[PDB]
């Protein structure tokens, strides 16, 4: 049903601007005892759903991971296609970040429009004003890509990204948990991706390592994976080649930069070079939000920057074998892959993240929004594929400038009085 | 009970067949078309092994238990035994010249009651026309190995698991309907029961494993995990990632190559790859049999050559994943913790028995070059004659039944199955440096 406007989780008086929680944190709180429970489950039930519905639903996992990337169709009633290739997803350019804003409420929005489905078809009567209310205060959680890890030093995937099962209620059974298969641990569609129904097969994609062009084979996968991709294994392994997490850790922590840094003062850690993002003074709109800017300035990295960074470490970014001191990091996915890199459910969470990090330094740089002689020609630029109602139009970057307008809100901007001490308490060396 | 342990039995039709390098095997059955009759046979006879229930002692469970924990009986054999630390232990051998002989009966157990498994599966889903083909199938089958001490091919320069061992699910036929293939999951990928298995009804449950790193005592936490692991469990992790810490296999091939010995080389000439040690295993001259089966013979290596015992020691570890607590920065690149590294709970990983089948063709190798070399130097002869629980035989000479011991399986083609490379004295060790050197 088109146009599908994109408002966020709509306003109920009794959830005023509901947080986004660091999914480490909201994982153990739901698996407490002293937690319903339900939040997990809602979120659980809801994406399984949407991940199971068919390729012609365009609410589908599928489709909405589509609008990013490969392959390159059709969102909404706005032409795919584009030219070589490529999607709506807006990279090297200082609308990245509201985009990607944009792109995440969607996300948020379809996952709880499916749990009020799970709640009107599974709940009972008697529960279903509980249920509703947990879904109402439920927003998408942030993957704290930049914060050490709870130990009862090290930055870690989310704890459930990293698990295959988790347990979740049945409704209207105190006792009842059960195991399931979980839909943020990975995405997988019922064949290899490069044999789906045209238009909608996912083509292998080009890559550049040691100067040498690669196709890294993700038409040859039928689930997403991090790291599992290597040159010379058997194509039966990449079908699936698992969620690598500890690789993924270990680059989080090892912080191989993709850029030279020649010069620098030091090499910073992902943590640090997150918190000088944050605290680093004087900059503009255009600096802030994009490698499309930059002669590069050093000790301190633009947002996209950092953003990339990530992708890479997470969905790992050496598909050929490397020299003897980076074998520990071998490895390809999909996340280090613009064309399908959302597909990976921990896309979603990073974004998240990003997000946040975004609203932060507005926070601390409220002068600075598409403001330079280089990010004002973008300001107005529509943000195809989403729609709005004003007569429905194109998202504008001016819209989402107060992401409380999408009805959400993050702890750390909720409480600004305190937010330079928060920024030091968490990313501070 | 008792289960009279034979090999698979003869037929005239299959003599002495031979157990497959199994990503020669894997490729075999997937590569030059869709020959998958052994690969099915394999996958959907395990398959019905690990889902029999914990009163079948011929369910996955059980016959691992045999191994290790949770240390109980197995076909009438009590358990209850203790190690050289007091601790409860189970019935295989460590650190006695009888490893190789008490583990070669361990793997022809499973060995054979997989093809028992594959039998039943033939009457009860192969259409009449198709009985024959399938049974002839069959009858050639024999459990494969892990040559953790090749190269693995590219369609070649690196030690690898095996490629069926990384793959979580596996394509099958659907013996009823040739053309037709159905993707499964793979029960050489992980084992796993339906609840965490520190919870199993007693007397089963697996317990924390106490294990020394660094000089200093850790309970790796196996009774909080539904999953066998390969370096998934890791100190002070949320132990809802233990219930399943995942089969983390690039970690395992990354520790292949790097081969972190645990004993002290200081002063050897030069510190081996894994497939050079095992070369050397194969060529020392001059060995007898204590040298060569077991870390008892000399207590202080363990304190330019390995033993046997002592290689399988590391491949174990190297594949499991040995470092639950952090170590220091510059070793993060290999933490993880997982069940073949543990005695106690080593046999639940499939791979386990893949490894111990290269075990049993090394000591066939080893025992082709070196004839006459068999407990009989002035340590390994007193254990020549112990018998080798819980395992039972039927004696035609006598018409009772014993337990094997280990001359029972010296000649291993006794148990009617055979290893290519033992097959041609003239050729073998050729063979060995064409593979290994």
């Known amino acids: 049903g088109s146009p599908y406007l994109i408002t966020g989780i709509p306003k109920d008086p009794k959830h005023p601007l509901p947080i986004r929680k660091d999914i480490d944190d909201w994982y153990l709180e739901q698996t407490s005892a002293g937690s319903n429970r339900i939040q997990l489950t809602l979120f659980v039930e809801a994406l399984t759903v949407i991940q199971n519905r068919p390729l012609n639903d365009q609410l589908s996992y599928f489709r909405l991971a589509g609008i990013h990337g490969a392959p390159w169709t059709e969102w909404d009633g706005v ?11 807006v990279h090297n350019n200082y609308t990245f970040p509201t985009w990607h804003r ?46 050490f890890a709870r130990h009862g030093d090290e930055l870690r995937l989310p704890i459930l990204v990293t698990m295959p099962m988790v347990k979740v209620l049945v409704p209207g059974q105190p006792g009842k948990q059960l195991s399931k298969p979980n839909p943020l641990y990975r995405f997988q569609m019922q064949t290899l991706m490069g044999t789906l129904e045209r238009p909608y097969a996912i083509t292998s ?52 930069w993709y850029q030279n840094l020649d010069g620098w003062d030091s090499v910073p850690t992902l943590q640090d070079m997150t918190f000088r993002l944050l605290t680093t003074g004087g900059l503009n709109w255009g600096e802030f939000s994009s490698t499309r800017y930059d002669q590069a300035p050093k000790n301190w990295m633009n947002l996209e920057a950092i953003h990339n960074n990530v992708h890479n470490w997470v969905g790992g970014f ?79 970057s001016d819209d989402v400038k107060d992401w409380r307008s999408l009805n959400y809100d993050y702890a750390i901007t909720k409480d600004a009085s305190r937010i330079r001490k928060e920024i030091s308490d968490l990313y501070g060396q």
């Open 102 to 147: 944009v792109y995440v409420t969607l996300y948020e929005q379809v996952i709880y429009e499916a749990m009020l489905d799970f709640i009107k078809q599974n709940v009972p009567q008697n529960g279903k004003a509980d249920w509703e209310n947990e879904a109402k205060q439920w927003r998408l959680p942030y993957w704290d890509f930049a914060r």
């Open 318 to 396: 050496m598909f050929s074998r490397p020299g003897r001191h980076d074998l520990k990091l071998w490895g390809a996915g999909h996340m280090s892959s613009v064309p399908v890199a959302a597909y990976d459910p921990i896309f979603w969470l990073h974004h998240c993240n990003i997000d946040r990090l975004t609203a932060i330094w507005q926070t601390v740089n409220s002068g600075s929004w598409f403001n330079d002689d280089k990010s004002k020609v973008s300001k107005d630029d529509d943000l195809r594929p989403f729609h709005r109602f004003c007569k429905v139009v194109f998202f504008r």
């Open 79 to 89: 032409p795919g296609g584009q030219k070589n290739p490529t999607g709506f997803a």
């Open 205 to 256: 994609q080009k890559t550049e390592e040691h100067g040498w062009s690669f196709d890294l084979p993700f038409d040859k996968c039928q689930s997403t994976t991090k790291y599992g991709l290597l040159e010379n294994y058997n194509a039966d392994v990449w079908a699936d080649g698992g969620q690598n997490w500890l690789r993924a850790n270990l680059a989080l922590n090892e912080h191989p």
